[PDB]
Amino acid sequence: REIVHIQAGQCGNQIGAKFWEVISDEHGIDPTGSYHGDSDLQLERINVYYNETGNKYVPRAILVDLEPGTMDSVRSGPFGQIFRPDNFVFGQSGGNNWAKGHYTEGAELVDSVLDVVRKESESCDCLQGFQLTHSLGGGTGSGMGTLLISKIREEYPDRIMNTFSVMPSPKVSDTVVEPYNATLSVHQLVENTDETYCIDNEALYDICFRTLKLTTPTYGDLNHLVSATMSGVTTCLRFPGQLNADLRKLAVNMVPFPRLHFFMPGFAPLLTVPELTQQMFDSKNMMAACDPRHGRYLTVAAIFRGRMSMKEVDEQMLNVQNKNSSYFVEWIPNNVKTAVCDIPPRGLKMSATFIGNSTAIQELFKRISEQFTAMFRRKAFLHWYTGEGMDEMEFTEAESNMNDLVSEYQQYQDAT
Amino acid sequence: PIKAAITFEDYLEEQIQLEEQELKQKQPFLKRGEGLARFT
Amino acid sequence: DPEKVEMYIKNLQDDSTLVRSIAAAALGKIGDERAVEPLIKALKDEDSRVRAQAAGALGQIGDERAVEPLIKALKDEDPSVRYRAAEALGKIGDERAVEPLIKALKDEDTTVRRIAATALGKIGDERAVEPLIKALKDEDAAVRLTAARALGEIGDERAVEPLIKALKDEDAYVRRAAAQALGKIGGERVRAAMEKLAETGTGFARKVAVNYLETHKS
Amino acid sequence: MRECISIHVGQAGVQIGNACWELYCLEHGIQPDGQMPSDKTIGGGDDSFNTFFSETGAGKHVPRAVFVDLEPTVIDEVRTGTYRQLFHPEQLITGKEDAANNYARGHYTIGKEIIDLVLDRIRKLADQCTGLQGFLVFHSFGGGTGSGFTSLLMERLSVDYGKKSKLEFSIYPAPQSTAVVEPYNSILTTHTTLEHSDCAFMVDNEAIYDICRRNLDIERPTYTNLNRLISQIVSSITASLRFDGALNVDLTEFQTNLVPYPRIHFPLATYAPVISAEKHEQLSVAEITNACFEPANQMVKCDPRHGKYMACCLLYRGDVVPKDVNAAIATIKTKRSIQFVDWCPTGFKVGINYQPPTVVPGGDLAKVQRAVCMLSNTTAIAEAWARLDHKFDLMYAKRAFVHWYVGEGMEEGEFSEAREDMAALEKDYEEVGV
């Protein structure tokens, strides 16, 4: 039943607040927590993300940042009134140093976060697991976010751990140490999460600039894509059906190998059933900067939203697999699952969201590894990482784990 | 507002020296396969 | 085929329970008397599906050597085995099975009670008349059906009055079997009883009595 | 008499159970509050339909049934529905964390936490029986609960209920929908249950789906449509057990004459007629009997023309006379070529249950005055197993998803043990087709 949401750092809290704004409108929850919708479909699975005292629905959301300024901006927002004030865990000094987030300032704050996590988990008949939004290029979302994952994992080893991780890009952010932070975090995510949606800033920037023809993209423009994707991927969890209805059934059907749990999210439109089906598998619609045609799909989930024929969706889905059989792993029969929800997202009448476990995701990891290795070979800025406690061997272990991850994807890409 | 760094690792060489320009003025970790242990 | 019989006889000692039960079934279809002693040994098999096939095969061959082992198979834990043994005992028709089959009419399982009743009628022993008269009052219609039929098949007059009561049964097939059984018994005991029913009796019972006196004249 | 406990496991089992007991109630004249005005005895009734319903002192007729699920959602609908008062609240048993499509969670880690309560409730149910004949177990092959918890339950039942017959109505998976790992759960559950089951009736969801589209003109069949059709078939099978009649064939006689051979205990069911309510003349005994041999009416996608029969049973219901069945059977023998094995006894076993088929009001089926269900033990069923085994093989060869199971209290060697057992079962079917 219940999912506990946690958002950590600058990126994590900005995209997290956008997620709550988007799903709050879909569920008829106003900024005061009152329900003002006109459908029982909305409140069928409302308890998955919202707590009840009765005349009020409150997001089961925990907001964390070492920099206090972030909690201020979220509180000033439209829905910066729905979040329970006691669930905001703010420090005083943030600085894109993974070691400070994972071992220093972040470690000093983590137990207070766990106290709130513990308090939320006490009021849940059937806790499904955890959903974390964060970026991997920073110091808090990355270093503290993965510390929170590790600590939560060893306190709740029987609960599914899910993340929406924002992969950094030099085309969006000027911070030189982001490859280090991303690599250190990817090592944690490989061992401690069940499913990670890779939201690539490289792909988001390319989409806004090249596809959406926005010559001046802001983080708000990138986050519009993120929120539309996050709403779509959680549709299965928020409404009735059968397909990937909870975090465990989803992970059991999406993850063939424990370490291969990094998903490539897609969205259409950026508007017929054949169009939504075709545009969903188009490289230009991927939220990870990887060409799916340059790899194979191990498992895929597609969520269609709107008024359309479930008969024609079945026809089109059978057809897309038939035409592109070469791009799907032949040794995982019926590896594409479809879900069709009647409620479309705000502003669209028909939409579809793709969630693929594709070996093409190795292209994103290769990009981070190439940057990390270029930095690490010259031992650039290592001093201020080891100066915060961290060991040099963690860099080596993280690099080797990520290269092992790449080779596994390549192994199954070429397999019978 | 997006502040882009990139042109490729040439930005890295330019920043290793820019870091040394500021100087001129003046714990147990996760192991590989540790998560796999959860499948025994 | 003699080499085929010898092959199935050896298969009765195979490690597989499927191989053993198929061989017992095949030996019953073949019907060679060479298989009688090996099939009697298969009646003491650890698996019930094998014991039941062996019991059925023994009825098909019909050797009297199997009468005592099949009588022991009537007191078996599995109802499929007791059904298959009761059926085989009636088929062989040895009247050593009359007393064991009489006790089998009081069996917890309906298939056994039906099969024991028809087996008693096949044997046609007069000893089974009092126990089959009590089977006419059975909770199940199929058991009453086979008991009525068996009483007619045996033909002892003690069953006349209870068969006339069965003409007023709730089940239509039971009433017709009882009427056929009364006709099969025949004689002055049935004729005098039909004379009473033709004037006093009502419904199907009256109809049967009037039809009996129409076809039984001078 | 001979009582029968029905056990409904997982979502498919419970939802099918709802369709069955809704139909049983209609067929027998039992109201949703359990009252049967019809029943003469208030402490009992007519003690023939008492095989499936116990009777309270108040005159309440309660199903001898247990509903079990690892998640509460499905059974909570039974607890708050039209039949919230038909069943006892302790006959509805639910965990909080479902098996998440994982056999190992259903059989080991999660299933353990409920098994003892289920067996205690079965031991209580058994106490109210004069002579328990056995169990009727409804479950999906694909689900974690339907596969794992059913196998666990079947193993535990065998300790002190071994001498009792166990029959299972199993939902064979079809992707049109499927969890990717359903072939794993399917092979795993078939292997573990095989030695503790007397007969298993498979119902291929794709076959039922296609009958709904073609025969009932339902463009998008729901599980409700599917379950209503399945329950009509279940009813025809169990009718001999719930209705007094001279021509009705008892469980012992039917199970012995359809599955006399131990491992090969999977018969193909065919039901006729399936007619839409939207339409209608009267189908004769010969016409419905002819329809039994058309592949469109089969419950499992298969061709009995490609295999050999080991046994065949015909379960008629309604306005059916024995002489008309004999004439219809004689006719089909002169047209159709029903090939039996060279060692099996040839011939058809026929059971005629007098009460005709009842339709659920609103249901897409027309009311017919006569219907039949054919159960044939054919070697053609190996085709259905081959399909499941092949999908299992593709994934297992790469060890895809295996970690989910090995992390939930199960050993990897159990996959190969289960698969080798299925390969032996396939070989058994080839051996009888001699």
Ligand SMILES: Nc1nc2c(ncn2[C@@H]2O[C@H](COP(=O)(O)OP(=O)(O)OP(=O)(O)O)[C@@H](O)[C@H]2O)c(=O)[nH]1
């Ligand atoms: N005929 C029929 N099939 C069903 C029904 N519900 C589910 N199925 C099928 O059963 C399979 C899914 O397994 P489920 O029975 O739902 O799972 P479960 O037994 O509850 O186990 P968990 O989901 O792991 O808790 C799929 O192949 C479905 O198509 C139903 O009511 N009727």
Ligand SMILES: Nc1nc2c(ncn2[C@@H]2O[C@H](COP(=O)(O)OP(=O)(O)O)[C@@H](O)[C@H]2O)c(=O)[nH]1
């Ligand atoms: N998509 C997205 N990326 C952002 C946003 N804000 C920052 N980022 C990314 O987040 C990273 C910066 O680290 P961050 O977690 O934000 O700062 P911290 O509070 O010191 O951890 C870089 O990868 C940025 O590109 C945002 O609102 N949206």
Ligand SMILES: [Mg+2]
């Ligand atoms: Mg379920």
